[PDB]
Structures are given as C-alpha cells and as structure tokens.
C-alpha cells in the first residue's frame, strides 16, 4: 500500500490545500483551512477529522508524527515554526473546522 490510499482525506488537505503556493492561493495557514472548510462538503471535512483522530489516538513520538505529516502525506507548510508539536497543530486543524 501507499499512505495516500489509506489516508486520502488528510492527503487531500495537505497536498492540494497546503501546496507550495498556499500563501498566494489562500493566505496564511488558517486562511487556507478556512478556504477548505468553505469549499469542501461537510462529509469531506468529517472524514478528514476522522483521519486526524486515527493519528492523534496513537500518541506517537513527535518525530514520527512529523515525518508522517511533512514527508509521507507531504504537507508543504512547515507548521513546526508556529507549533510546538505535530499533535498541537493537528488539534488546531480539528478545532478550526468547528462553528
């Protein structure tokens, strides 16, 4: 298998929205999250949130979770410059989805 076969919802956020041009297309990381929320269906974001939960529940060592987000799922946004850990950034994405 390949990781995006089993994590397609997070792969979609991290590759299509957090592409290398996210600052020009959408703006800052939270404006990017807002564009995703506005554009995509409720079903899409609930399935993305479910994938976040599959990751968070494992309590991985931060270096492993960071390799997953940055290298395997291939996020272009270097969130560690704003966030102390990969867990904290994922919890932030999750919360940004709410009302």
């Amino acid at each position: 298998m390949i990781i995006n076969e089993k994590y397609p919802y997070l792969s979609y956020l991290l590759r299509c929205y957090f592409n290398q041009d996210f600052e020009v297309l959408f703006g800052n990381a939270d404006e990017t999250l807002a564009a995703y929320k506005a554009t995509e269906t409720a079903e899409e974001r609930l399935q993305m949130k479910a994938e976040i939960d599959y990751l968070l529940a494992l309590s991985l060592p931060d270096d492993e979770l960071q390799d997953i987000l940055l290298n395997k799922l291939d996020c272009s946004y270097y969130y560690p410059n704003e966030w102390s850990s990969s867990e904290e950034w994922l919890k932030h994405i999750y919360k940004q989805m709410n009302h």
Binding site: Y12, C16, Q20, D21, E23, L25, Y36, E40, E44, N81
Partner: protein
C-alpha cells in the same frame, strides 16, 4: 491573476533557497524549463485521464491531485535546514473544476516532487 505553475519553472537555486529559509514551506521545487514543465503536465494529464473524467462527472471536490512518476530528472528541489539541491524525477499537478474551460478544468499549479 497569474498562472501559479510559473512560480515553479526555471527558478534559481537562490530563489528556492529563499523560500525555505525566510518563507514558511518545508521545501520548494522547480521544473528545469518551460519545455519540461509542459511535457510533464501533458503526460500527467494523459496518464490520469480516467481519474480526471471521474472527478469531473461525479465529484464535489474543489481540486484534484494528479501525480507523475518517472526515472529522468525534470527539475530541482531544496529543503529547509540544508542548501543541498536535489534532482527530482516525479511531479504533482493540481487542477480545479472549471466548466468554462474546454477540458472542464484549469491547472492551478504544479511542481516536481521528491
């Protein structure tokens, strides 16, 4: 606006390295030249035409990722924390549904991927 793929054609090492230090991306990449960017874009669309066709007819997604794999360098990449320039053989194109275009989509951006 502009065509964002052009942010990833023929860029200098200096330009890419600036994006990964002062900028906020983990890595930055660029196709070698326009002929290469065009060739890769066309091959990626043609090899994913089934996926594009399903996307246009059945999907409410805002965008679609289409990937290109090869064993021949099509550009360069740099990563945060290092000045090493890597040659890269794969690529990613992002399209969006756009009924006004003849194909039904527009190319949002694209670039090499390690």
């Amino acid at each position: 606006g502009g065509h964002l793929i052009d942010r990833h054609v023929g860029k200098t090492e200096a330009e890419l390295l600036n994006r990964v230090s002062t900028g906020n991306v983990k890595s930055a990449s660029s196709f070698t030249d326009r002929t290469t960017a065009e060739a890769v874009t066309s091959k990626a669309i043609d090899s994913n035409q089934a996926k594009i066709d399903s996307y246009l007819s059945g999907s409410q997604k805002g965008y679609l990722e289409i990937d290109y794999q090869s064993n021949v360098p099509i550009g360069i990449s740099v990563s945060r924390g290092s000045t090493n320039v890597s040659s890269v053989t794969n690529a990613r194109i992002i399209i969006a549904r756009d009924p006004s275009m003849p194909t039904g989509y527009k190319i949002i951006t694209g670039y090499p991927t390690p």
